[PDB]
Design a binder for this molecule. Structure first.
Ligand SMILES: O=C(Nc1c[nH]nc1-c1nc2cc(CN3CCOCC3)ccc2[nH]1)NC1CC1
Ligand SMILES: [Cl-]
Length: 289
């Protein structure tokens, strides 16, 4: 049974006004929508179930993981509807778009970088405390509200640790951001997210992850065999050390999310999230051209 599944008599085309496409998830297409009862904006993920299966388990898993999260740092899930062969997944709308989108007008400053990383860390701390691993941390999966709030999204490949399953070994993620132990399919846990966080830190600083000019297949041997990436360029030493802390080949040498919240880069540079509205305004003016 799918968590949050609504009465099959309920017609989502009547309950929601479906508007323009705003992106593509690991599964399904995502639209801006209006809740016709409250008039709030929602995000609507639509998946065609007849074209799918072999992905249906994964879709169920994503919804299950979402339904089990209750955090200001994780996109809220409002339920699912079936219309003929299509599943409508109703999600919290984050009007600012992704951190990746917000990078298009130009570089971030280190206050912005620290603030976004701090909020991602709050989300990871929550997830890891719940014995969940995101496994696809990257700037495209970091979403901002219109108020500058920062939340984690796309739990399409998220994993769950139990007391009989202390580690995972599944090959999932986005290659440039994947930890060496995940690529090698060694036993791994929440520390894999910390590595991905390190890559995301470089992405927020430089605009792209390491190896971004290479074919994804090449990083399948490059990441396990090479020394870890470092942040190159004129960035503060605390930021460079934050990145180095995350990007260690030995998972036990990586700090926890909780520990990184106290890292000197974060404490010295992060400010209130409301300031990130400037970043949204910049994007708005930019795409206005
Ligand atoms: O779950 C997702 N998205 C969201 C959940 N809640 N809110 C969103 C969301 N996703 C958003 C994406 C954008 C970017 N625009 C897309 C259309 O072309 C101009 C830029 C802006 C606001 C957005 N809000 N998946 C991402 C789109 C692939
Ligand atoms: Cl740059």
């Amino acid at each position: 049974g799918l968590p949050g599944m609504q009465n099959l008599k309920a017609d989502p085309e009547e309950l929601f006004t479906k508007l323009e496409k705003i992106g593509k998830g690991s599964f399904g297409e995502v639209f801006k929508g209006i809740d016709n009862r409250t008039q709030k904006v929602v995000a609507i993920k639509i998946i065609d179930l007849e074209e799918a299966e072999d992905e249906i388990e994964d879709i169920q898993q994503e919804i299950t993981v979402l339904s089990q999260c209750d955090s200001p740092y994780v996109t809220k899930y409002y339920g699912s509807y079936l219309k003929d062969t299509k599943l409508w997944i109703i999600m919290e709308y984050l009007g600012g778009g992704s951190a990746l989108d917000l990078l298009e007008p130009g570089p971030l400053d280190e206050t912005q970088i620290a603030t976004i990383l701090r909020e991602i860390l709050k989300g990871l701390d929550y997830l890891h405390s719940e014995k969940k691993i995101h496994r696809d941390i990257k700037a495209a999966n970091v979403l901002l509200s219109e108020h500058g709030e920062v939340k984690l999204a796309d739990f399409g490949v998220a994993g769950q640790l139990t007391d009989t399953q202390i580690k995972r070994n599944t090959f999932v993620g986005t290659p440039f951001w994947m930890a060496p132990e995940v690529i090698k399919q060694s036993a791994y846990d929440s520390k894999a997210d910390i590595w991905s966080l390190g890559i995301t830190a470089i992405e927020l600083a430089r605009g792209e992850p390491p190896h971004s000019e290479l074919h994804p297949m090449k990083v399948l041997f490059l990441i396990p065999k090479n020394n870890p990436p470092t942040l190159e360029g004129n960035y503060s030493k605390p930021l460079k050390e934050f990145v180095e802390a995350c990007l260690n080949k030995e998972p036990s040498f990586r700090p926890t999310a909780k520990e990184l919240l106290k890292h000197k880069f974060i404490l010295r540079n992060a400010k209130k999230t409301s300031y990130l509205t400037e970043l949204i305004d910049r994007y708005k003016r930019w795409k206005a051209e």
